[PDB]
UniProtKB/Swiss-Prot annotation, chain A:
Gene designation: pam
Keywords: Alkaloid metabolism, Cytoplasm, Isomerase, Lyase, Phenylalanine catabolism, Phenylpropanoid metabolism, Taxol biosynthesis
Lineage: Eukaryota, Viridiplantae, Streptophyta, Embryophyta, Tracheophyta
GO cellular component: cytoplasm
NCBIfam families for this protein: phe_am_lyase, taxol_Phe_23mut
Name of this protein: Phenylalanine aminomutase (L-beta-phenylalanine forming)
First-listed, main subcellular location of the protein, grouped into a coarse class: cytoplasm
SUPFAM superfamilies: L-aspartase-like
Catalytic activity field: L-phenylalanine = L-beta-phenylalanine; L-phenylalanine = (E)-cinnamate + NH4(+)
GO molecular function: intramolecular aminotransferase activity; phenylalanine ammonia-lyase activity
Pathway note: Alkaloid biosynthesis; taxol biosynthesis; Phenylpropanoid metabolism; trans-cinnamate biosynthesis; trans-cinnamate from L-phenylalanine: step 1/1
Pfam families hit by this protein: Lyase_aromatic
Keyword Cytoplasm attributed: yes
Binding site for (E)-cinnamate: 212, 300, 306, 336, 408, 436, 439
Curated annotation (Swiss-Prot), chain B:
The encoding gene: pam
Name of the protein: Phenylalanine aminomutase (L-beta-phenylalanine forming)
UniProt source species: Taxus chinensis
Complex and partners: Homodimer. Homotetramer, dimer of dimers.
Biotechnology remark: Could be used for the stereoselective biosynthesis of beta-amino acids via amination of cinnamic acid derivatives.
Keywords annotated in UniProt: Alkaloid metabolism, Cytoplasm, Isomerase, Lyase, Phenylalanine catabolism, Phenylpropanoid metabolism, Taxol biosynthesis
Hydrolase as UniProt keyword: no
């Protein structure tokens, strides 16, 4: 299952300490994300060296013999007609011309730049590039010392200009500003000195080798794909939590349904959902709910839950397939020419072309928009009393609803999130211009597309944060609801006794106490125009009619007393249970307990109301930060403990 | 290799006579497309395989409904209305069809018969899994209607994925007077009349039968199936033609070297390069390219432009998208897309959402982007071929001339290629991002698969247009390269012989013959002895050089002036003669000979010029039609025979 | 002319000292942009003009609420909750703010202070119309917060258009501890502390006040105002630089001829052509162009390519879109965007939807499309400029060289221009097509105007990058055209005097002087005496022609001497003039202010391997100048006297 694969990505991200770059060992997207986000993670360039040295001396030797090789003794791009013997000045002229971005401050963040540096280092280990081993060591050192150039955000059609700033750093160009950690910014020469390095003078092919790859697009795509995998599993898992709070029917995930429509992502998401909902205590409440007035209640759930495994199927498959493609690019010699030193040949091709990453970045952005729409639809159902099977509108606790609009702000924001997200998911690759003196008449735009997918994922994180917060609210409302109904039942039953009401009367009134959604009358339980009293008055007329001629005047006396005793005691009992619940059980047997505990206990939150001074912002920000920084994976892995061994 | 998978699809499309429908035998996209396009192809519904399953499920549903079991859409209202129960079993089903006959014929716009018959096939196949509760007899009628070429007229729009369009198939089956049915190509009659013409009687719907007939993804999956078959064929065609482009543009075949792609191993990159290396190995045109770059070596590009050199890298995601989508579409073809799913063995009506065409929907969006990427590659390749700065000797616009002021060659096709690519890029925006909360907010997510499939189909029509033009242009360039080779020899011969006749020194002779070799012939074909055009310019500078190098000089100047006069009355005539001869050979040794032979001989075309009366339209239409009806696959399979 | 209008906007942006907020005086996009960008610009809320009507409306709302009148969001719930009544007037309003403080600070991303302060201005302005029921004191507080540079930190997303983001301004006013306020550039404190520092106390919301504070289009319209100001300025800038493009590319100015555009009278087409006709009328560069096409006339294009020739036709809809959208945004700026509308003069509350930012949302989509169109125009021009086949004499990549093997000129910028245009085109897809049924399906149409304005803002950022690059390339090309002219004269002089020294006839001399004038100098600058390059090719061809012609020994001797003396004198003298140039026709050009601004004020020079400043260093200067408005000085100088 893809579930176990993603769990494997998360463990690797958590547990990796050194990244081995040797030209043989695969770097996964988890390794890239770990390098970028965990500074205790070090790069270990393991000598591979022999290959690199053979390669660079072959290039240098051939260049000096005046051999005809692109970008070595030849001009660049549309300029391969021009030959030259000025080997080092050719290379330097290329870097000078590519330092051409502008700071608008918008920039490629250090995380992406350091990732790009790792990726360039990795490409070099295959021994096709002709770069000196010493330049590779310098990259390892810069990576391990938190040194990276400030890089302008835009300019690549995929990554000459952005990679030129890495080259600029290595050759100590004064105009190239370099970060050292989070605050320090110094010119390249000073940056090199602070970590015990000297500026390089570019040898044959070295300028081109440094700039002629897909490192930036693939770096952004790697962290994009790591996040997409985590958030995907998070979304699939939360569909189960949605089912629990919405009073869904868990049969939507029954294996036979998906066996007969066997998209792998359909089978696997449902298999997960079946396992999460098996023996659910909330599914117990659900079944009990639909057994009461069965023929007045929906036979099927709405699409946002029932159709989730079918919806998720292409999204799972897109995210998993894109991960393979991105990792293939990570572990590739993206460079040109390809030096075949064993067969004494330089091969001319186009491994700098980031089209594999570009196209898959477009697809993933559409899939991410699809995940967002799923969340939007679930969230929407949850806010509307007509679709939430007992829950209050906007998940407002009240009881005074005139001054508690619950999660309405979060609801409005969810539409704003989803709308921008859908917009973002238009393709980037359909916008290819004929570029660079029409030499680059196809170009992938992979970095631009990866940037937009990253932005889409930022929005997805907001939507997940809001959704999980709303569901924790719904858990609290469902647990309070169960407790409130039991209180109403007890008060009604004990008062039926005190007033000496017949058994026919007692059973009719107790049915009303069980059947009526408590949130429809919580605001004012003894309001005669609200559903509890309406139902009781209806049953009281029905009991008078059924017991007539089988003492009417005394019955009415006792029914009037029942109402008056209810008026003096019911509200207080309902208030007391709610005040108790608010001071601080079904979730305890649910597979979603780790999520509820995490949000409530570890993040320090509570059921939302007018009595809780924390704003919706303050609650959701906490959840969002924990999703953004990876802490959310702890309750996730706890939740999935034991799934498929 | 995917190349072998696509060749397998093509062969299956040509060769299938009967499509077996039995609940176990998979239906491929080639099968669906063959049914739609070849009316000799018949459906075989197998009783032994699945009849028992179908009838067991049918009797289960009818019995449980009669005993008043609570099951969605059999004793229950539809969509947002599942709260309402009824025992009016047959009228519940009848009311659903009535409500769904709600499409509109605009202008007319309609789902074509090919799509409608494909959907009938797919709905029939869905029923074979025995989860639907439909009567075997209804399935037999579907088989008979399919084999008799009877299908309803269906409105284009109304589905969010396929209730409204499928209700028209249900309407035909129940003999609704308002539903019009086609019988073959010529007749259309009301549904009651169509049924009796093929010996069928109108069905009265039983429990679940209305819902079973409409609750599928049959139309989206029908359109997607033919979409995916075409995407596979056109992809292989596009890949293959990258080799032909290399041959005529004077590319360096080294771009396809296996080591380059071994170190960047996207499967589509490796596989497309493998194909290209094979196509270009020992090519006679690649020998010409080699000679070309050996003359004035250091003044010509060391590398080709991206439209060729970067083609395997570009093709990689496109290959993989098209192949993965084929798998996904075929999975949908071979699925019980219906609800509820009846588990008769365990006495359970399972409530889910297999009517949701999301797998098809999202993958249609991806394919349309990939098709757009294929179009962009063709556009960039076509553009290079039209511009003399980038075509390495070929005349601008591939204008034969000789008088270029009255021959603008393939300029019309060039402009059209931009128009095609532009619309295609626009079409490739996604449909799946436009989900509306639908049907009383019951359908708060919906696939839009049919709409997306339709747009991908439109994108493939434009791709066909682009392939047709591109192939046409490359045959033009083939004729121009072979004519170039002959013309150069003629000039070399005239210069060599006239150097002797005029008794020129061996220094002069060799220097003049190098000019005849080096100067691109199409730069002076218009007026070969025009003193301002490159041939005479090169001979003039060489004539000053030989005077300076050998400096009796008066006699040398006399011999050079006699050379100029003798050239000025003999050269043009000899060139005209060979050109006329050609208008009445390295392609003979090329893997792309089948394509050239097909376009020139079988389709009866020739080199384009002012002397050929046939218009670009007439030439490209022939090629388009051959792509559209599948005749293009013959030269393609011939071109590829022996590969792997 | 729209050109006068845009100049009026630029002048107003620079000249304004006080923004009068009084319920009658229009606020323009220039005024908003000025408040946002010039901290010395102050708000003046005028009591004399609107205080009276504000207090009448204030008193009306409060008394009706206390009387228990049934008025939306005053004695009723909000949005989908209008069926719920209350008499808890203040708590109703405070529950609305509590509920809308629901944004998240993502990585930090936020609506910037410029946008927030503009939104504060626009909200205050809304209130001056006297339909809102807000207290005068609250308006005074907004004025005071604006002039003291206090503004809340606002999350970027959450509005479908501007409840959530406006709730942070309301949160500041009522002293929410959770709301962080900026004071100037380097101070951030909780709202209660920020109110204290400016002498204000937290407000207690009265009837309707919460809703009044949040129920407008202030954020969408704030970002749209600065978007439109920028769009006007950058539009005029692009239009003007089409004239500079014509000059450097050797264009034919006939494309701007008044009759062409009279017979296809789109106002943007007429007006852009009129500007371009005037910019090029007495151009020294157009004289060079006329001379260029007179040499080998029948071997050179009769027409320019579309990027120049089709520019008025192309600019026409873009001019009109940006102008009309400006009108639309200002109508919104000067509107009572609020609900209910209190009609106190007729004793009634009016229930509508003036909070709907659809006018702005839709026009933001149109403008983003227009801005993409302006980008495509700049890309096409830049592309032509970099390609020798299409530049009419200029070197490829505008590489000075002379050694082209180690000077790739502006190739970096050329690649960047494709990236800029590519992303720009993608951005131009509409936002308004993505309307979700929102807020318990109460907001089943919503404008998404803030989201759209943000995307149009991002498009304009990219357009600024493209303009900076384009102008930098055109300045490069000015230098290259001027050097070209000075180089051709040296070659003509060297050929002429050496033909004299060597005693060559007048037939020979005239032929050789023709070659020197006709051959584009940049095709042989790398090595002028290389026998395989166009100068010596043309001279060798001419020398053979003069030998056959004058035929009836020493002539061959004198020509061999000419060719030898050429390889000794020519390169050194061409080098000399170039070296002098690195250490004129622009002086008569209307685009002198731009060239002077970029070269002198910004301190740049012709780009080459000898100039150590990187393209980044040069273009950043030009971009910074465009971004901060300094570019309008050269723009206004250039346009002086145009009427």
């Amino acid at each position: 299952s893809h579930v176990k694969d993603i769990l494997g990505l998360i463990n690797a991200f958590n547990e990796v300490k050194k990244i081995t770059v040797d030209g043989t060992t695969p770097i996964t997207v988890a390794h890239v994300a770990a390098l970028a986000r965990r500074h205790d993670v070090k790069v270990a360039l393991e000598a591979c060296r022999a290959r690199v040295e053979t390669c660079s001396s072959w290039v240098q030797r051939k260049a000096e013999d005046g051999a005809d090789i692109y970008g070595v003794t030849t001009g660049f791009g549309a300029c391969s007609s021009r030959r030259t013997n000025r080997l080092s000045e050719l290379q330097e002229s290329l870097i000078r011309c590519l330092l051409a971005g502008v700071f608008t401050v918008d920039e490629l963040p250090a995380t992406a730049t350091r990732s790009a540096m790792l990726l360039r280092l990795n490409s070099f280990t295959y021994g096709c590039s002709g770069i000196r081993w010493e330049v590779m060591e310098a990259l390892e050192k810069l990576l391990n010392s938190n040194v990276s150039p400030k890089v302008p955000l835009r300019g690549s059609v995929s990554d000459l200009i952005p990679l030129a700033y890495i080259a600029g750093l290595l050759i100590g160009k004064p105009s190239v500003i370099a970060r050292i950690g989070d605050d320090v910014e110094v010119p390249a020469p000073e940056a090199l000195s602070r970590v015990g390095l000297r500026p390089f003078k570019l040898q044959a092919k070295e300028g081109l080798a440094l700039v002629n790859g897909t490192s930036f697009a693939t770096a952004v795509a790697s962290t994009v794909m790591y996040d997409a995998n985590v958030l995907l599993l998070l979304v699939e898992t939360l569909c189960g939590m949605f089912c629990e709070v919405i009073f869904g029917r868990e049969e939507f995930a029954h294996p036979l349904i998906h066996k007969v429509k066997p998209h792998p992502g359909q089978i696997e998401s449902a298999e997960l959902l079946e396992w999460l909902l098996r023996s659910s205590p909330f599914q117990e409440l659900s079944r009990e709910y639909y057994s009461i007035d069965k023929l007045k209640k929906p036979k099927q759930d709405r699409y946002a839950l029932r159709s989730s495994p079918q919806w998720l199927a292409p999204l799972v498959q897109t995210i998993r397939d894109a991960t393979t493609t991105v990792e293939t690019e990570v572990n590739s010699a993206n460079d040109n020419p390809i030096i075949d030193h064993a067969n004494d040949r330089a091969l001319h091709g186009a491994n700098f072309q980031g089209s594999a990453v570009g196209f898959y970045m477009d697809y993933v952005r559409i899939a991410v928009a699809g995940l967002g729409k799923l969340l939007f639809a679930q969230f929407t159902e949850l806010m509307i009393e007509y679709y939430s099977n007992g829950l209050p509108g906007n998940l407002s606790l009240g009881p005074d609803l005139s001054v508690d609009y619950g999660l309405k702000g979060l609801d409005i924001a969810m539409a704003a999130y989803s709308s921008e997200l859908q917009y973002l998911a238009n393709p980037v690759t359909t916008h290819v211009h004929s570029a660079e003196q029409h030499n680059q008449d196809i170009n992938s735009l992979a970095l631009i597309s990866a940037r937009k997918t990253e932005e889409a994922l930022d929005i997805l994180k907001l939507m997940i944060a809001s959704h999980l917060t709303a569901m924790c609210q719904a858990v609290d409302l469902r647990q309070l609801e169960e407790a409130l109904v039991k209180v109403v039942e007890n008060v009604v039953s004990t008062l039926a006794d005190e007033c000496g009401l017949p058994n026919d009367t007692k059973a009719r009134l107790l049915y009303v106490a069980k059947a009526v959604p408590v949130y429809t009358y919580l605001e004012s339980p003894c309001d005669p125009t609200l559903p509890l009293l309406l139902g009781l008055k209806q049953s009281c007329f029905d009991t008078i009619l059924a017991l007539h001629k089988k003492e009417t005047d005394t019955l009415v006396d006792r029914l009037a007393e029942f109402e008056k005793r209810l008026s003096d005691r019911l509200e207080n009992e309902m208030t007391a249970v709610r005040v108790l619940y608010e001071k601080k059980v079904r979730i305890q047997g649910s597979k979603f307990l780790p999520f509820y505990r995490f949000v409530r206990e570890e993040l320090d939150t509570g059921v939302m109301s007018a009595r809780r001074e924390q704003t919706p912002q303050e609650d959701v920000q906490k959840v969002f930060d924990a999703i953004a920084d990876g802490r959310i994976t702890v309750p996730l892995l706890h939740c999935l403990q034991g799934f498929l061994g």
